[PDB]
Amino acid sequence: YMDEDVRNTLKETAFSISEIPFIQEDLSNGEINSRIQEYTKHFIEAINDVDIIVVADMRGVKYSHLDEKQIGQVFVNEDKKEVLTQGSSYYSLMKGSMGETLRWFQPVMYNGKQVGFIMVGKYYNEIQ
Amino acid sequence: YMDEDVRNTLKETAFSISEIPFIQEDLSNGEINSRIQEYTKHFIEAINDVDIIVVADMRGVKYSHLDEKQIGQVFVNEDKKEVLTQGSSYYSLMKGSMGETLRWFQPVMYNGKQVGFIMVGKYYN
Amino acid sequence: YMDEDVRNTLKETAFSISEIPFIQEDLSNGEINSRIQEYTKHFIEAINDVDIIVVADMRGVKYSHLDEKQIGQVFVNEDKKEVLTQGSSYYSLMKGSMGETLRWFQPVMYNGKQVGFIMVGKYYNEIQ
Amino acid sequence: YMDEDVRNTLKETAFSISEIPFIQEDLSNGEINSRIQEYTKHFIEAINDVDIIVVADMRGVKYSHLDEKQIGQVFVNEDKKEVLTQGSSYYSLMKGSMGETLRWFQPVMYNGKQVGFIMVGKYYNE
Amino acid sequence: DKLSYMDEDVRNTLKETAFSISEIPFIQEDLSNGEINSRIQEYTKHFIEAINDVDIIVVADMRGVKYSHLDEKQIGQVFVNEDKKEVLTQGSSYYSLMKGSMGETLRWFQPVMYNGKQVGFIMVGKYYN
Amino acid sequence: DKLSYMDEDVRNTLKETAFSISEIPFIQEDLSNGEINSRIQEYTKHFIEAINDVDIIVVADMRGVKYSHLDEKQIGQVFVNEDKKEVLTQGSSYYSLMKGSMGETLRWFQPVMYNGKQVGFIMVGKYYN
Ligand SMILES: [Cl-]
Ligand SMILES: [Cl-]
Ligand SMILES: [Cl-]
Ligand SMILES: [Zn+2]
Ligand SMILES: [Zn+2]
Ligand SMILES: [Zn+2]
C-alpha cells in the first residue's frame, strides 16, 4: 500500500519542519542543540505514520528520532527462534533487513542557500 | 576475525542484564514497567559498541532502545545524494537495508525456567 | 516599533502551529496532553520575538507558555523601590500592567470546523 | 480589605523562602544557579493562590516563575471574541493589561545586610 | 574537668531549615492528604545540595517517614569506612554485618501543623565522623 | 546452645546484584576516569527501587564513595525511631545526638576492575531493624 494519505502525511510533516525559522538557523549555525533534537520527537509520538525522522545538515545526520518499538522489531524478528526454543546463547549476523521503508526527502533552505535536508519515513514489514 | 572486543562487549552487556533480579521478575510478571524500559537506555548511551538493545519475553519484544543517530543513518545513506546535490524533493522506497548488524542473543531465566531473552547488537556498513 | 519583521514572525509562527495535524486533533479531542504543552515551549525558547504563546480550544486557554523573565519584569518593575531601599515588607495592588503587547490571533481548523485558536505575541515595555 | 487567607499565603510563602540559607547566599554571591531557579517552580505548581514568584538581588530580577495558564489568559481575554466567533485572523495591540494583581514584597537578608527581595503575587480579573 | 562543645551556627542552620519547610503550605497539605507526591520528594533534595551543614532530611507523616534525602557521599562513607579495610587492602570480596555506624549525628525535630492539628514532623541533621 | 541464622536468598541477591554492576563496561570506565556522571548516579537508583532486599548501594573509586543510593523510607527510620518518641507524642521541638545506630546491616563488597587493574568497589546491603 502506497496510498496517498501516507505519502501526504510524510510530505506535510517534512515541509512543516523545513519551514521553521529556528530549524533553518540551527542547520546553518552547525551548533548542536538538544532542544531541537527533542523537538523532532513530537512527530514520532503524535503522528502514527511517522516511524522515522532525520534532520541533516551538509555534513550529515545531525538530529534523529525513530519509533523504537517499530524499528526494534526489524532487528529482532530474524533468528530469534533458537534462543526462544532452546536456551541457547549465540551470535547472528544479519545482512541487511526485512521489509521496506518509504521515505520523503525535503531540502532545507536559509537565506536562499541550502543548509541541509529532512527525511521522513514509514516502515512496512508486510506489503499489502 | 570479527573483532573480539566487540563480541565481548555484546556478550558481557547482555549477560549482565540477564543476571539482574528485577529484569527476571519483570519478564516473568508480564507487567509493563517504564522504569525498566528506561533502564535499558543507559547501555545505548554509555556503551559505544551497543547500537541496539532488545528485551523480550516469551510473547515478544517488550522493551527496546536504539542509537537513534546510528540507526537513522541506515534509513538515509541510500538515496540522499539527490536532495543533497540538486536541492530537490522526492519519495524513495528502500527495500531492506544496507550494511550488516552483529547481534548476540542471551536467554533470561527465572526460578529455573526461561522467561525471555535479551538481544544486543552493533551495526556496521 | 511595529515593524513588519516582528509582525511577520508572529504570523508565521502561529500559522505554522495551526497547520500541524496533531495540534488540530488535540484541540478537537479535548484531552489534555503534556507533550503538546511542552511542544509550545520551543517557540518561546528559540524565537526571540515570541514572548507569549497561547493555544486555546473552544472552551478556553488549554496550553500556554511565556518568556518567564520577560513577563516576570512586568509584574515587578512597579513599586519595588520601597523594599529595595528600606527593608520594608508590604502589600501592593497593581492594576493592571505597564507597557504594551502585540498579539496575532489565528484560528485552528479540523475537518473543516474551527476547534480553537492560537495567539502569539511580543511584549514591549517602551514604545520605540 | 481583600481576603486574609490569600494575604496570609503570600506572606508565609515569601517569608519561608526568605529564610532559606542557600537563597540568601545565592543572592549575595551574584552567581546564577539553575537549581535555585527550579526551586521557585514548586511554589507556583503546589500553591493555588501563587500565580507569580520573583526573586531579585540588588541589581534586579534574578529568578522568576509564573502560572503560565493564569498569566496567559491576561494577554488573551480582551480581544479573543473575533477569532472565536467569526473565525478570522488579525493583529491586536493591547495597551497595559486588565485586572489587578496583589503582591507582597519581602526583603532578603544575609549576615545582617539586605541582599535582595522576594515578591509573591496572585492575579485577579475582578 | 570535662569540656563539651556547642556550634550554634550548625544548630541554627538545622532549626531554620526545618522551620522554613514546616511553614510551607503545600508541605502541610501533603502530609495531611497522605498522597505520595514525587515533586515534594524532589523539593527536599535542594536542601541537601545547597546547604553544606545538612546531610539528612526526613519528612514524616503520623504513619512514618514519607519523604527523605541524604548527602549520599557523606552517608555512604559511614557504611564503608568501618569494614572497608579488607577490600581496599587486598580483601577482596566478602560479607560483613555492621552494628552500628559509628560516628555521631546531630538532629533537630520539628513538628508540622495543618489547620491547627499536627500532621507529622521534619527532622534535619548533620553527620560527624 | 546458640542458633545463628543464614538467609541465602538475601546473600545471593546482594552478590548477584553487585556482581552484575561490576561487570558493566561503562561502570568500569567511569570509575577509572574519575569524572562525575549523573546518569551513572541515576543508574544505581533502579536497584533500590526494583529489588526489595537492596536497601543500600554504594559505588566507590579508590578515592572514596562516588555514587550512592538508599531506600530513603527504610534508612530514614534508622535516624528517627530512637528519639522520634518525644516530637511524635508531646509538643515538641528539640535537638538530639544519636551516637551510632540501632539495628544491623548486611553488606557485600565487590571490587571493580578495568583493563586488569582494580579501580574501585561496589557495596550492596540490606538493613535489619
Ligand atoms: Cl527464526
Ligand atoms: Cl545515493
Ligand atoms: Cl517604584
Ligand atoms: Zn519538545
Ligand atoms: Zn535509569
Ligand atoms: Zn526542585
Side-chain angles (χ1 to χ4, degrees), chain F residues 42-65:
Chain F
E42 192 285 341
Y43 176 84
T44 63
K45 191 170 181 158
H46 297 273
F47 300 92
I48 302 298
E49 296 172 352
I51 310 173
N52 191 31
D53 289 334
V54 177
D55 301 332
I56 308 179
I57 189 184
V58 170
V59 177
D61 164 358
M62 303 303 345
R63 298 173 55 185
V65 172

PDB file of all heavy atoms in Angstrom, chain F residues 42-65:
ATOM      1  N   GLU F  42      22.171   7.997  38.549  1.00  0.00           N
ATOM      2  CA  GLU F  42      20.780   7.577  38.372  1.00  0.00           C
ATOM      3  C   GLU F  42      20.673   6.067  38.127  1.00  0.00           C
ATOM      4  O   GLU F  42      19.735   5.414  38.602  1.00  0.00           O
ATOM      5  CB  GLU F  42      20.140   8.373  37.223  1.00  0.00           C
ATOM      6  CG  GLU F  42      18.623   8.255  37.096  1.00  0.00           C
ATOM      7  CD  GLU F  42      18.147   6.945  36.518  1.00  0.00           C
ATOM      8  OE1 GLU F  42      18.950   6.245  35.884  1.00  0.00           O
ATOM      9  OE2 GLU F  42      16.956   6.624  36.677  1.00  0.00           O
ATOM     10  N   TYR F  43      21.631   5.514  37.388  1.00  0.00           N
ATOM     11  CA  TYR F  43      21.628   4.086  37.082  1.00  0.00           C
ATOM     12  C   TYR F  43      21.496   3.217  38.328  1.00  0.00           C
ATOM     13  O   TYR F  43      20.803   2.194  38.309  1.00  0.00           O
ATOM     14  CB  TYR F  43      22.897   3.698  36.317  1.00  0.00           C
ATOM     15  CG  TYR F  43      23.014   2.215  36.052  1.00  0.00           C
ATOM     16  CD1 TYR F  43      22.390   1.643  34.964  1.00  0.00           C
ATOM     17  CD2 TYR F  43      23.763   1.393  36.882  1.00  0.00           C
ATOM     18  CE1 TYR F  43      22.499   0.293  34.703  1.00  0.00           C
ATOM     19  CE2 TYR F  43      23.875   0.040  36.631  1.00  0.00           C
ATOM     20  CZ  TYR F  43      23.234  -0.506  35.537  1.00  0.00           C
ATOM     21  OH  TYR F  43      23.321  -1.852  35.258  1.00  0.00           O
ATOM     22  N   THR F  44      22.155   3.627  39.406  1.00  0.00           N
ATOM     23  CA  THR F  44      22.131   2.851  40.638  1.00  0.00           C
ATOM     24  C   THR F  44      20.773   2.874  41.327  1.00  0.00           C
ATOM     25  O   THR F  44      20.464   1.998  42.134  1.00  0.00           O
ATOM     26  CB  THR F  44      23.155   3.380  41.663  1.00  0.00           C
ATOM     27  OG1 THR F  44      22.818   4.724  42.036  1.00  0.00           O
ATOM     28  CG2 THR F  44      24.575   3.337  41.100  1.00  0.00           C
ATOM     29  N   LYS F  45      19.965   3.877  41.013  1.00  0.00           N
ATOM     30  CA  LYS F  45      18.664   4.036  41.647  1.00  0.00           C
ATOM     31  C   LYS F  45      17.704   2.873  41.332  1.00  0.00           C
ATOM     32  O   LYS F  45      16.877   2.507  42.162  1.00  0.00           O
ATOM     33  CB  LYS F  45      18.075   5.391  41.233  1.00  0.00           C
ATOM     34  CG  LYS F  45      16.839   5.857  41.992  1.00  0.00           C
ATOM     35  CD  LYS F  45      16.550   7.313  41.634  1.00  0.00           C
ATOM     36  CE  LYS F  45      15.349   7.914  42.358  1.00  0.00           C
ATOM     37  NZ  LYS F  45      15.393   9.409  42.423  1.00  0.00           N
ATOM     38  N   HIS F  46      17.841   2.274  40.153  1.00  0.00           N
ATOM     39  CA  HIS F  46      16.960   1.172  39.754  1.00  0.00           C
ATOM     40  C   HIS F  46      16.998  -0.007  40.692  1.00  0.00           C
ATOM     41  O   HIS F  46      15.998  -0.707  40.873  1.00  0.00           O
ATOM     42  CB  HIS F  46      17.350   0.654  38.376  1.00  0.00           C
ATOM     43  CG  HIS F  46      17.201   1.664  37.306  1.00  0.00           C
ATOM     44  ND1 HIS F  46      16.022   1.856  36.629  1.00  0.00           N
ATOM     45  CD2 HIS F  46      18.075   2.570  36.815  1.00  0.00           C
ATOM     46  CE1 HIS F  46      16.179   2.830  35.753  1.00  0.00           C
ATOM     47  NE2 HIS F  46      17.415   3.275  35.847  1.00  0.00           N
ATOM     48  N   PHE F  47      18.164  -0.246  41.269  1.00  0.00           N
ATOM     49  CA  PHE F  47      18.349  -1.408  42.118  1.00  0.00           C
ATOM     50  C   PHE F  47      17.641  -1.266  43.444  1.00  0.00           C
ATOM     51  O   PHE F  47      17.050  -2.225  43.937  1.00  0.00           O
ATOM     52  CB  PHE F  47      19.831  -1.713  42.232  1.00  0.00           C
ATOM     53  CG  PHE F  47      20.453  -2.012  40.902  1.00  0.00           C
ATOM     54  CD1 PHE F  47      21.041  -1.001  40.151  1.00  0.00           C
ATOM     55  CD2 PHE F  47      20.397  -3.286  40.374  1.00  0.00           C
ATOM     56  CE1 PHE F  47      21.597  -1.273  38.917  1.00  0.00           C
ATOM     57  CE2 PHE F  47      20.948  -3.563  39.137  1.00  0.00           C
ATOM     58  CZ  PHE F  47      21.548  -2.557  38.405  1.00  0.00           C
ATOM     59  N   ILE F  48      17.649  -0.064  43.990  1.00  0.00           N
ATOM     60  CA  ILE F  48      16.935   0.185  45.224  1.00  0.00           C
ATOM     61  C   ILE F  48      15.436   0.003  44.960  1.00  0.00           C
ATOM     62  O   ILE F  48      14.766  -0.764  45.639  1.00  0.00           O
ATOM     63  CB  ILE F  48      17.157   1.617  45.725  1.00  0.00           C
ATOM     64  CG1 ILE F  48      18.642   1.903  45.939  1.00  0.00           C
ATOM     65  CG2 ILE F  48      16.386   1.851  47.009  1.00  0.00           C
ATOM     66  CD1 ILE F  48      19.311   1.040  46.985  1.00  0.00           C
ATOM     67  N   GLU F  49      14.942   0.693  43.933  1.00  0.00           N
ATOM     68  CA  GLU F  49      13.523   0.679  43.551  1.00  0.00           C
ATOM     69  C   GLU F  49      12.951  -0.693  43.244  1.00  0.00           C
ATOM     70  O   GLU F  49      11.906  -1.071  43.767  1.00  0.00           O
ATOM     71  CB  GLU F  49      13.313   1.521  42.284  1.00  0.00           C
ATOM     72  CG  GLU F  49      13.614   3.003  42.409  1.00  0.00           C
ATOM     73  CD  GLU F  49      13.567   3.736  41.072  1.00  0.00           C
ATOM     74  OE1 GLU F  49      13.450   3.074  40.018  1.00  0.00           O
ATOM     75  OE2 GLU F  49      13.678   4.982  41.070  1.00  0.00           O
ATOM     76  N   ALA F  50      13.633  -1.423  42.369  1.00  0.00           N
ATOM     77  CA  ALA F  50      13.141  -2.706  41.879  1.00  0.00           C
ATOM     78  C   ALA F  50      13.518  -3.950  42.672  1.00  0.00           C
ATOM     79  O   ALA F  50      12.910  -4.992  42.470  1.00  0.00           O
ATOM     80  CB  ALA F  50      13.568  -2.883  40.427  1.00  0.00           C
ATOM     81  N   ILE F  51      14.522  -3.864  43.539  1.00  0.00           N
ATOM     82  CA  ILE F  51      14.930  -5.028  44.318  1.00  0.00           C
ATOM     83  C   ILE F  51      14.597  -4.769  45.772  1.00  0.00           C
ATOM     84  O   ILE F  51      15.171  -3.890  46.404  1.00  0.00           O
ATOM     85  CB  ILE F  51      16.426  -5.331  44.155  1.00  0.00           C
ATOM     86  CG1 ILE F  51      16.784  -5.368  42.669  1.00  0.00           C
ATOM     87  CG2 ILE F  51      16.771  -6.656  44.821  1.00  0.00           C
ATOM     88  CD1 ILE F  51      18.266  -5.494  42.389  1.00  0.00           C
ATOM     89  N   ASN F  52      13.671  -5.564  46.292  1.00  0.00           N
ATOM     90  CA  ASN F  52      13.195  -5.424  47.655  1.00  0.00           C
ATOM     91  C   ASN F  52      14.289  -5.569  48.710  1.00  0.00           C
ATOM     92  O   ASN F  52      14.362  -4.771  49.640  1.00  0.00           O
ATOM     93  CB  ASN F  52      12.083  -6.449  47.919  1.00  0.00           C
ATOM     94  CG  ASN F  52      11.356  -6.201  49.228  1.00  0.00           C
ATOM     95  OD1 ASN F  52      11.224  -5.056  49.668  1.00  0.00           O
ATOM     96  ND2 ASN F  52      10.853  -7.270  49.843  1.00  0.00           N
ATOM     97  N   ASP F  53      15.153  -6.567  48.551  1.00  0.00           N
ATOM     98  CA  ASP F  53      16.218  -6.810  49.530  1.00  0.00           C
ATOM     99  C   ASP F  53      17.425  -5.874  49.456  1.00  0.00           C
ATOM    100  O   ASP F  53      18.371  -6.045  50.223  1.00  0.00           O
ATOM    101  CB  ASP F  53      16.691  -8.264  49.450  1.00  0.00           C
ATOM    102  CG  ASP F  53      15.658  -9.240  49.979  1.00  0.00           C
ATOM    103  OD1 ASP F  53      14.834  -8.837  50.826  1.00  0.00           O
ATOM    104  OD2 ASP F  53      15.698 -10.420  49.574  1.00  0.00           O
ATOM    105  N   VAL F  54      17.410  -4.899  48.555  1.00  0.00           N
ATOM    106  CA  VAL F  54      18.522  -3.972  48.457  1.00  0.00           C
ATOM    107  C   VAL F  54      18.122  -2.618  49.010  1.00  0.00           C
ATOM    108  O   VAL F  54      17.402  -1.874  48.363  1.00  0.00           O
ATOM    109  CB  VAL F  54      18.986  -3.791  47.015  1.00  0.00           C
ATOM    110  CG1 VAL F  54      20.091  -2.753  46.945  1.00  0.00           C
ATOM    111  CG2 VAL F  54      19.474  -5.115  46.462  1.00  0.00           C
ATOM    112  N   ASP F  55      18.615  -2.299  50.203  1.00  0.00           N
ATOM    113  CA  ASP F  55      18.309  -1.036  50.857  1.00  0.00           C
ATOM    114  C   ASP F  55      19.409  -0.005  50.665  1.00  0.00           C
ATOM    115  O   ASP F  55      19.194   1.184  50.906  1.00  0.00           O
ATOM    116  CB  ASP F  55      18.136  -1.256  52.355  1.00  0.00           C
ATOM    117  CG  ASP F  55      17.035  -2.250  52.689  1.00  0.00           C
ATOM    118  OD1 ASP F  55      16.073  -2.371  51.899  1.00  0.00           O
ATOM    119  OD2 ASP F  55      17.121  -2.876  53.775  1.00  0.00           O
ATOM    120  N   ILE F  56      20.594  -0.455  50.267  1.00  0.00           N
ATOM    121  CA  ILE F  56      21.730   0.440  50.096  1.00  0.00           C
ATOM    122  C   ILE F  56      22.630  -0.042  48.985  1.00  0.00           C
ATOM    123  O   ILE F  56      22.913  -1.231  48.863  1.00  0.00           O
ATOM    124  CB  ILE F  56      22.606   0.471  51.386  1.00  0.00           C
ATOM    125  CG1 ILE F  56      21.752   0.760  52.630  1.00  0.00           C
ATOM    126  CG2 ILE F  56      23.799   1.430  51.267  1.00  0.00           C
ATOM    127  CD1 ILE F  56      22.518   0.798  53.940  1.00  0.00           C
ATOM    128  N   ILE F  57      23.117   0.906  48.207  1.00  0.00           N
ATOM    129  CA  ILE F  57      24.034   0.614  47.136  1.00  0.00           C
ATOM    130  C   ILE F  57      25.068   1.737  47.106  1.00  0.00           C
ATOM    131  O   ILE F  57      24.724   2.925  47.106  1.00  0.00           O
ATOM    132  CB  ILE F  57      23.293   0.476  45.790  1.00  0.00           C
ATOM    133  CG1 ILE F  57      24.232  -0.050  44.715  1.00  0.00           C
ATOM    134  CG2 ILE F  57      22.660   1.795  45.348  1.00  0.00           C
ATOM    135  CD1 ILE F  57      23.563  -0.114  43.364  1.00  0.00           C
ATOM    136  N   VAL F  58      26.338   1.356  47.122  1.00  0.00           N
ATOM    137  CA  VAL F  58      27.411   2.314  47.094  1.00  0.00           C
ATOM    138  C   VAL F  58      28.420   1.922  46.061  1.00  0.00           C
ATOM    139  O   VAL F  58      28.782   0.760  45.941  1.00  0.00           O
ATOM    140  CB  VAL F  58      28.115   2.391  48.442  1.00  0.00           C
ATOM    141  CG1 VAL F  58      29.386   3.217  48.333  1.00  0.00           C
ATOM    142  CG2 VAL F  58      27.171   2.969  49.481  1.00  0.00           C
ATOM    143  N   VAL F  59      28.852   2.904  45.293  1.00  0.00           N
ATOM    144  CA  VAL F  59      29.846   2.697  44.278  1.00  0.00           C
ATOM    145  C   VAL F  59      30.952   3.670  44.603  1.00  0.00           C
ATOM    146  O   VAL F  59      30.742   4.881  44.651  1.00  0.00           O
ATOM    147  CB  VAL F  59      29.301   2.976  42.877  1.00  0.00           C
ATOM    148  CG1 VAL F  59      30.409   2.807  41.844  1.00  0.00           C
ATOM    149  CG2 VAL F  59      28.131   2.052  42.581  1.00  0.00           C
ATOM    150  N   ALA F  60      32.138   3.130  44.830  1.00  0.00           N
ATOM    151  CA  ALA F  60      33.277   3.939  45.194  1.00  0.00           C
ATOM    152  C   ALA F  60      34.474   3.684  44.300  1.00  0.00           C
ATOM    153  O   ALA F  60      34.657   2.577  43.800  1.00  0.00           O
ATOM    154  CB  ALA F  60      33.656   3.639  46.630  1.00  0.00           C
ATOM    155  N   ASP F  61      35.264   4.736  44.093  1.00  0.00           N
ATOM    156  CA  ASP F  61      36.518   4.667  43.350  1.00  0.00           C
ATOM    157  C   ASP F  61      37.575   4.529  44.425  1.00  0.00           C
ATOM    158  O   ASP F  61      37.243   4.437  45.602  1.00  0.00           O
ATOM    159  CB  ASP F  61      36.721   5.981  42.547  1.00  0.00           C
ATOM    160  CG  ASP F  61      38.148   6.209  42.042  1.00  0.00           C
ATOM    161  OD1 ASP F  61      39.065   5.412  42.300  1.00  0.00           O
ATOM    162  OD2 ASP F  61      38.361   7.256  41.401  1.00  0.00           O
ATOM    163  N   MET F  62      38.844   4.526  44.039  1.00  0.00           N
ATOM    164  CA  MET F  62      39.907   4.378  45.020  1.00  0.00           C
ATOM    165  C   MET F  62      39.997   5.570  45.953  1.00  0.00           C
ATOM    166  O   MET F  62      40.604   5.460  47.005  1.00  0.00           O
ATOM    167  CB  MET F  62      41.239   4.075  44.347  1.00  0.00           C
ATOM    168  CG  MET F  62      41.209   2.825  43.454  1.00  0.00           C
ATOM    169  SD  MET F  62      40.649   1.142  44.344  1.00  0.00           S
ATOM    170  CE  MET F  62      40.791   1.605  46.249  1.00  0.00           C
ATOM    171  N   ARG F  63      39.389   6.705  45.593  1.00  0.00           N
ATOM    172  CA  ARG F  63      39.399   7.899  46.458  1.00  0.00           C
ATOM    173  C   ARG F  63      38.302   7.794  47.516  1.00  0.00           C
ATOM    174  O   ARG F  63      38.461   8.251  48.639  1.00  0.00           O
ATOM    175  CB  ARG F  63      39.169   9.201  45.665  1.00  0.00           C
ATOM    176  CG  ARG F  63      40.205   9.551  44.622  1.00  0.00           C
ATOM    177  CD  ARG F  63      39.756  10.768  43.807  1.00  0.00           C
ATOM    178  NE  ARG F  63      39.444  11.940  44.636  1.00  0.00           N
ATOM    179  CZ  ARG F  63      38.935  13.082  44.165  1.00  0.00           C
ATOM    180  NH1 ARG F  63      38.670  13.219  42.871  1.00  0.00           N
ATOM    181  NH2 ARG F  63      38.686  14.096  44.992  1.00  0.00           N
ATOM    182  N   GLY F  64      37.169   7.215  47.143  1.00  0.00           N
ATOM    183  CA  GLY F  64      36.066   7.073  48.075  1.00  0.00           C
ATOM    184  C   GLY F  64      34.727   6.942  47.384  1.00  0.00           C
ATOM    185  O   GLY F  64      34.644   6.742  46.171  1.00  0.00           O
ATOM    186  N   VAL F  65      33.669   7.044  48.177  1.00  0.00           N
ATOM    187  CA  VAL F  65      32.304   6.936  47.676  1.00  0.00           C
ATOM    188  C   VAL F  65      32.087   7.955  46.578  1.00  0.00           C
ATOM    189  O   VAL F  65      32.347   9.132  46.771  1.00  0.00           O
ATOM    190  CB  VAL F  65      31.276   7.155  48.804  1.00  0.00           C
ATOM    191  CG1 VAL F  65      29.860   7.249  48.248  1.00  0.00           C
ATOM    192  CG2 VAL F  65      31.378   6.032  49.831  1.00  0.00           C
TER     193      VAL F  65
END
